[PDB]
Swiss-Prot record, chain A:
Record's comment describing the protein's domains: The C-terminus (residues 99-159) is sufficient to bind and neutralize toxin when expressed in E.coli.
Function: Antitoxin component of a type II toxin-antitoxin (TA) system. Neutralizes the bacteriostatic effect of cognate toxin ParT by inserting into its active site.
Translocase found in the keyword field: no
Molecular-function GO term, any one: DNA binding
Family (UniProt): Belongs to the MbcA/ParS/Xre antitoxin family.
Annotated stretches, region: Sufficient to neutralize toxin: 12-72
Record protein name field: Prs ADP-ribosylating antitoxin
Subunit note: Forms heterotetrameric ParS(2)-ParT(2) complexes. The 2 antitoxin fragments do not make contact in the crystal structure.
Higher taxonomy: Bacteria, Pseudomonadati, Pseudomonadota, Alphaproteobacteria, Sphingomonadales
Keyword set, alphabetical order: Toxin-antitoxin system
Parent sequence residues shown: 88 to 159 of 159
From Swiss-Prot, chain B:
InterPro entries: RES_dom
Protein name: Prs ADP-ribosylating toxin
Consequence the record notes for mutating residue 57 to A: No longer toxic
Molecular-function GO terms, alphabetical: glycosyltransferase activity; nucleotidyltransferase activity
Keyword Protease: no
Outcome recorded upon mutating residue 46 to A: No change in toxicity
Any Pfam family matching the protein: RES
Membership in a protein family: Belongs to the MbcT/ParT/Res family.
Amino acid sequence: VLGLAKLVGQLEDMVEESGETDGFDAPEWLSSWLRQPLPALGGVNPIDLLDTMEGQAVVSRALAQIQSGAFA
Amino acid sequence: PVTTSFWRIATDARTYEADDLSGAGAKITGGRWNEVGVAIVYAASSRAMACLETVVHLNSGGLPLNRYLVEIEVPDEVLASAEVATPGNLPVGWDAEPAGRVSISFGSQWAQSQRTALLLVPSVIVPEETNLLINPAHPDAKGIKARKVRKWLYDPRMIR
């Protein structure tokens, strides 16, 4: 199970807290991000990790670090 | 100057700000050099490096975030006391992607031992250049200051 809604919600919360929500299409942005290499994860596409609970946790953490400012 | 500047590209959040020195953000998420629950401040030795670590490495361009360039002014006498980790003296595996137990453990031992208030570490992006870790729990971290100096607008996914 991909659970995209949970990741969209996470992203929407982040933009609400830390940016501007007006005009922002979170599912559209998430779609591209999931399908692009993520250097923090060694160049893998995040979508390819969403088939395990561990991979789900890893992707959610990376998304959260966008806001937290921890280096990945 | 009697200080040396390090850099963050950071956002305000609901319970901490971009110029936070309490390490609140990294406490929540963890990072390459810290466990969830341990507060640490991550900064870069150049503004260019802060962009690579913050925007490029997490592929976070295109988000309508209110990002700030934050200057972290570190007293030179505190920097003189920093530990310096290098690719040569770090344990093998520090540069794993995704970050794994080697760098997280190294960072944890440094933080909990309180060996030094500051740890200079190589970037996994450019190992020859450095990031700074600040342990806000360390007595010597007193005197470090942080301020938003401008909006950070450079976003490689920006649409004109």
